[PDB]
């Protein structure tokens, strides 16, 4: 297991524009196109991202290319975020994957409400952090995925994904 395999499980792979769990136009492996309810705006974003007229459909290679870009940008974002970087750097490699996963799903804006969880993670108070992480809109809206990510934070193992 690694971050790509982990997010591939959590996000799936769809080659046609679809709406994510929040109702937002998305494609590939959780590549958010726009929060606009306008499908045409989503198609424009898609074409811009891929560099051709896609008419709402991409290939697996194209999906994987966006995925690589998205994972990389997520990590690089964490590293330039003064609140997230010290916590991220305090973690072992497996828990770092949980951090990347959460940011990938919620964005840095989404992680802004997790100050108390972050503190517990940096303190390596794993059970306490796990309890705190679940007290969230995130948990309640996507519980099965959040449970997997939280188990990863709690244990620093891949137990929730090796299935
Ligand atoms: O927990 N979700 C995101 C992050 C944690 C620590 C650095 S990023």
From Swiss-Prot:
Task: List positions binding substrate.
Answer: 32, 104, 117, 132
Annotated EC: 3.2.1.17
The entry's localization annotation reads: Host cytoplasm
Q: What is the effect of changing residue 26 to E?
A: Complete loss of activity at neutral pH; covalently bound substrate
- Main localization category: host cell
Instruction: Please list the residues that make up the active site.
Output: 11 (proton donor/acceptor), 20 (proton donor/acceptor)
What's the impact of mutating residue 20 to A/N/S/T?
Complete loss of enzymatic activity
Q: Is Hydrolase there in the keyword field?
A: yes
Report the superkingdom from the record: Viruses
Query: Broadest EC class?
Result: hydrolase
Q: Does the keyword Hydrolase apply?
A: yes
Q: What results from changing residue 30 to A? A: Almost complete loss of enzymatic activity
- Give GO terms for biological process: cell wall macromolecule catabolic process; defense response to bacterium; peptidoglycan catabolic process; viral release from host cell by cytolysis
Disulfides per UniProt: none
Reaction(s) this enzyme catalyzes, per UniProt: Hydrolysis of (1->4)-beta-linkages between N-acetylmuramic acid and N-acetyl-D-glucosamine residues in a peptidoglycan and between N-acetyl-D-glucosamine residues in chitodextrins
TM spans (from-to)? none
Entry keywords, A to Z:
Antimicrobial, Bacteriolytic enzyme, Cytolysis, Glycosidase, Host cell lysis by virus, Host cytoplasm, Hydrolase, Viral release from host cell
Which GO MF terms are attached to this record? lysozyme activity
Q: What induces it?
A: Expressed late in the viral replication.
Q: What is the effect of changing residue 117 to I?
A: 500-fold decrease in enzymatic activity
Q: Which GO terms describe its cellular component?
A: host cell cytoplasm
Q: How does activity depend on pH?
A: Optimum pH is 7.3.
Q: Which family does it belong to?
A: Belongs to the glycosyl hydrolase 24 family.
What is its biological role?
Endolysin with lysozyme activity that degrades host peptidoglycans and participates with the holin and spanin proteins in the sequential events which lead to the programmed host cell lysis releasing the mature viral particles. Once the holin has permeabilized the host cell membrane, the endolysin can reach the periplasm and break down the peptidoglycan layer.
Spell out the protein name for this chain.
Endolysin
Source organism (scientific name): Enterobacteria phage T4 (Bacteriophage T4)
Lineage, highest ranks first: Viruses, Duplodnaviria, Heunggongvirae, Uroviricota, Caudoviricetes
